[PDB]
Amino acid sequence: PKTVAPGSTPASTGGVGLGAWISVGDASLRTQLANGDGSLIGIHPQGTLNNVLTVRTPEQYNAVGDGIADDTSKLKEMLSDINNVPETLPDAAAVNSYMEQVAVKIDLTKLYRFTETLYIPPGVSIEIPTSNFFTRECKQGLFYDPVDKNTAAISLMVYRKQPDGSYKLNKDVDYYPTGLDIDNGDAITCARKIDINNLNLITAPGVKVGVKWIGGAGCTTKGLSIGENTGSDITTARLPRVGLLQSASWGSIHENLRILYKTQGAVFIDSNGGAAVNNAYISRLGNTNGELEQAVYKPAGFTEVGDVAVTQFAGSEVKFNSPIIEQASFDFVHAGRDTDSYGLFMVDKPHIESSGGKKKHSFYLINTSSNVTLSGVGLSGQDPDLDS
Amino acid sequence: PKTVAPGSTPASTGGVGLGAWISVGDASLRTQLANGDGSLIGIHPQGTLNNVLTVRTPEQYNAVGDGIADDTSKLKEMLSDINNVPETLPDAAAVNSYMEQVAVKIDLTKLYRFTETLYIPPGVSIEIPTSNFFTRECKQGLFYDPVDKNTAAISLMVYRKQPDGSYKLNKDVDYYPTGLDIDNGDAITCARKIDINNLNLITAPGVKVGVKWIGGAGCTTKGLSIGENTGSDITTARLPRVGLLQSASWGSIHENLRILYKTQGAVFIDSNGGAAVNNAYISRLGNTNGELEQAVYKPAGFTEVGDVAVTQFAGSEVKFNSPIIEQASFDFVHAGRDTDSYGLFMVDKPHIESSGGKKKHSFYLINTSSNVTLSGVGLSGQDPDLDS
Numbered sequence: 001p002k003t004v005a006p007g008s009t010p011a012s013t014g015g016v017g018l019g020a021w022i023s024v025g026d027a028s029l030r031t032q033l034a035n036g037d038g039s040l041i042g043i044h045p046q047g048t049l050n051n052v053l054t055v056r057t058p059e060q061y062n063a064v065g066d067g068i069a070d071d072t073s074k075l076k077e078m079l080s081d082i083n084n085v086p087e088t089l090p091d092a093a094a095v096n097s098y099m100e101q102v103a104v105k106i107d108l109t110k111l112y113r114f115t116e117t118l119y120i121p122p123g124v125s126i127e128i129p130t131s132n133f134f135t136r137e138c139k140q141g142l143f144y145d146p147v148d149k150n151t152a153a154i155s156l157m158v159y160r161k162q163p164d165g166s167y168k169l170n171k172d173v174d175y176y177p178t179g180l181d182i183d184n185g186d187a188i189t190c191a192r193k194i195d196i197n198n199l200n201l202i203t204a205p206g207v208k209v210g211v212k213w214i215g216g217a218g219c220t221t222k223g224l225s226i227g228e229n230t231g232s233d234i235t236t237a238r239l240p241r242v243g244l245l246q247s248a249s250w251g252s253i254h255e256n257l258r259i260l261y262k263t264q265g266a267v268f269i270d271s272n273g274g275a276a277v278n279n280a281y282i283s284r285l286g287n288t289n290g291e292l293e294q295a296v297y298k299p300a301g302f303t304e305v306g307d308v309a310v311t312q313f314a315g316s317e318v319k320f321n322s323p324i325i326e327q328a329s330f331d332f333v334h335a336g337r338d339t340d341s342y343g344l345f346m347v348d349k350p351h352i353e354s355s356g357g358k359k360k361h362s363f364y365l366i367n368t369s370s371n372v373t374l375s376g377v378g379l380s381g382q383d384p385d386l387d388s
Numbered sequence: 389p390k391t392v393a394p395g396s397t398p399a400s401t402g403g404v405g406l407g408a409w410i411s412v413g414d415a416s417l418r419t420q421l422a423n424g425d426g427s428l429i430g431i432h433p434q435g436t437l438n439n440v441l442t443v444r445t446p447e448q449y450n451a452v453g454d455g456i457a458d459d460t461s462k463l464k465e466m467l468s469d470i471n472n473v474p475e476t477l478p479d480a481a482a483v484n485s486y487m488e489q490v491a492v493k494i495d496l497t498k499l500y501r502f503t504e505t506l507y508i509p510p511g512v513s514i515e516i517p518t519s520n521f522f523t524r525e526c527k528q529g530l531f532y533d534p535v536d537k538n539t540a541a542i543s544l545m546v547y548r549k550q551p552d553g554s555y556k557l558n559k560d561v562d563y564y565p566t567g568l569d570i571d572n573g574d575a576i577t578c579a580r581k582i583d584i585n586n587l588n589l590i591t592a593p594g595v596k597v598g599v600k601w602i603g604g605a606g607c608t609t610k611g612l613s614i615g616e617n618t619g620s621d622i623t624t625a626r627l628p629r630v631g632l633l634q635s636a637s638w639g640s641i642h643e644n645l646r647i648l649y650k651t652q653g654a655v656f657i658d659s660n661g662g663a664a665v666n667n668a669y670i671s672r673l674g675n676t677n678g679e680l681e682q683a684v685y686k687p688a689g690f691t692e693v694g695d696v697a698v699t700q701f702a703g704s705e706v707k708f709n710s711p712i713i714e715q716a717s718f719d720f721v722h723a724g725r726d727t728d729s730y731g732l733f734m735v736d737k738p739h740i741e742s743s744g745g746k747k748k749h750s751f752y753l754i755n756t757s758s759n760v761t762l763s764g765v766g767l768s769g770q771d772p773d774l775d776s
């Protein structure tokens with residue numbers, strides 16, 4: 001005989017399974033199925049449903065996915081269930097271990113409004129069926145809509161050494177680690193095994209930075225698409241002031257990156273050895289008042305006023321293969337490393353265009369060398385004296 | 389008490405749910421499961437089955453998938469359920485709106501025979517597990533088998549203006565929009581947010597055009613594979629005369645495109661700024677009678693006879709990187725724009741080969757400039773006077 005004390009549960013009196021409690025009847029089947037993992041369902045050629053379910057979705061966490069409801073905690077919970085990285089860690093060994101966990105794929109098929117910077121832990125693949133392209137109304141992806149606009153929508157994890165030898169996750173928008181920081185332990189990257197396929201990210205007007213790709217060595221992107229072609233007034237367009245900011249990401253590859261921006265498209269700083277940006281399509285949403293934008297992250301030698309599609313400095317040498325740059329005051333601003341002019345400006349066959357022939361310079365090169373191959377496409381601006 | 393009138397249903401007497409009607413028993417469960425969406429099946433770490441099922445297949449529509457039965461209506465239904473765009477539209481706002489719908493991924497794992505041109509609407513991702521490569525018998529993909537061979541197997545959507553001011557979907561096999569048409573309003577593209585991975589397309593012998601990549605700005609492809617390596621006799625092979633025809637597709641990228649053709653491999657016309665074709669493997673199925681093939685779509689300046697692997701004109705300047713071209717009479721035929729010679733012919737390290745050393749010319753250049761990098765692979769024809 002089996003004695004069951006008052007206040008018992010099947011789980012607390014032997015569990016449910018062979019030799020213990022066995023579910024019987026329809027009510028129990030309903031709950032067994034509803035609270036299971038799919039193991040009750042057989043599949044072909046053999047095995048059970050759970051054996052083949054590996055993707056995660058915000059819907060599993062009840063995200064509304066309409067770009068209205070605040071789905072922040074749902075997205076964070078989804079991320080946490082994959083790899084929950086505490087914001088404070090004791091030492092190097094502790095932060096490094098979070099890059100040695102199981103990686104999981106996430107599929108974003110609706111529109112998720114969020115109001116706090118999302119930090120992607122290592123071991124994450126994010127996918128969306130297709131990439132946005134001058135999309136007027138974003139329907140699938142992330143919509144960053146915070147109270148504090150002096151922030152980034154998305155950011156990789158980089159831990160900063162504290163006075164007591166402990167490490168705290170960086171949450172400062174303007175911060176980016178240097179190759180030196182990574183060498184001397186002042187910063188420790190917690191960004192690895194991250195893959196993006198078609199992530200669409202829109203932003204409330206005025207948000208400072210779209211994506212902070214910091215410390216992402218070996219991390220990859222394909223079809224990453226930033227910004228919304230909301231309307232003619234860029235001042236209300238749902239796109240960030242700065243599309244992407246990248247540092248300490250050697251060996252990182254961005255395939256067919258798409259960026260709709262207001263102030264700066266993409267910025268690459270310090271160590272990014274061997275990193276490539278292929279077939280990028282970077283455009284200011286029209287060039288109205290473009291010449292009045294003020295670059296936010298720029299080398300000291302660049303003091304000119306005007307929007308910049310691509311900015312690079314502090315020894316960064318990203319390879320730009322066949323980029324398409326549109327509607328920019330400055331297509332490229334590049335500075336060699338202050339100390340020795342290190343960092344070759346490499347642009348192969350750029351497709352440069354701007355409505356009404358409005359432009360300041362295509363290649364603004366400071367204390368540097370370069371190898372550029374022209375493809376019979378380009379222009380110089382309307383000022384007969386200053387534009388070149 | 390609850391009174392239920394004769395001829396009632398649960399829906400007509402309060403609905404199903406808390407505070408109303410609740411399903412009870414095995415029979416109810418069987419029907420709920422059969423007619424549901426997976427919501428009764430829990431999965432890990434939380435949520436239900438419906439939350440993670442996002443991919444569509446033709447099997448959901450009972451397609452036979454054997455390459456014999458005509459699965460046309462079922463492929464069309466699957467496409468329509470994703471984005472059902474009317475063949476006739478009121479104005480531009482109307483057609484533009486269809487590029488702002490939720491995108492869906494389709495997985496093709498069997499062989500689907502169809503008999504009318506398939507029009508891929510915006511917001512569609514297509515994937516097949518692997519790409520065909522000189523495949524003798526196509527097992528997975530699409531097989532176009534029409535009564536009228538003067539047609540295209542697959543086409544993107546471009547709307548043509550009508551005398552009354554309305555717009556109609558183009559169904560003319562030879563039509564392609566120009567940059568001028570798009571600028572005009574004469575044409576409005578409805579091809580955006582389309583991604584193709586490993587799509588295998590074979591066609592009945594005699595089919596004019598395999599794929600009409602028109603207006604596909606920012607659309608991408610990887611492993612698109614056209615044509616079947618049926619047998620030694622090309623007149624009987626399951627491949628089209630013209631593999632791919634592209635126009636108005638600036639920023640479109642074709643990665644590792646594979647084409648087996650009879651007349652012309654790929655054709656690129658008019659505005660295609662910044663578009664790239666990487667590691668294409670284009671080959672006529674042998675060169676037997678290749679010299680007699682007459683190019684269908686080509687510039688006026690080209691009047692020679694012979695098959696052409698790659699044809700480009702009207703100001704199109706697609707970048708061809710590491711293409712592999714085999715058994716062609718003419719590897720490339722390129723004409724700069726009539727008015728100002730615009731449109732640089734760019735080919736980087738082409739791997740050119742032809743059986744028996746049979747060939748007319750590799751680079752037939754008309755009213756144009758070019759930058760070509762040779763990789764120590766190539767040859768010139770057997771005519772000691774004309775071939776170069």
Ligand SMILES: OC[C@H]1O[C@H](O[C@H]2[C@H](O)[C@@H](O)[C@@H](O)O[C@@H]2CO)[C@H](O)[C@@H](O)[C@@H]1O
Nearest residue numbers: 296297298299300301313314315335338
């Ligand atoms: O030597 C490193 C780098 O330091 C300064 O860069 C600034 C930059 O000007 C700001 O826009 C922002 O991004 O912070 C950076 C340093 O944290 C110098 O101005 C620059 O020339 C130099 O390369």
Ligand SMILES: OC[C@H]1O[C@H](O[C@H]2[C@H](O)[C@@H](O)[C@@H](O)O[C@@H]2CO)[C@H](O)[C@@H](O)[C@@H]1O
Nearest residue numbers: 684685686687688689701702723725726
């Ligand atoms: O000015 C554009 C273009 O017009 C003609 O191109 C023809 C082509 O010859 C045909 O094969 C077919 O594709 O229709 C095209 C447009 O009607 C000229 O022959 C060509 O040279 C010219 O660049």
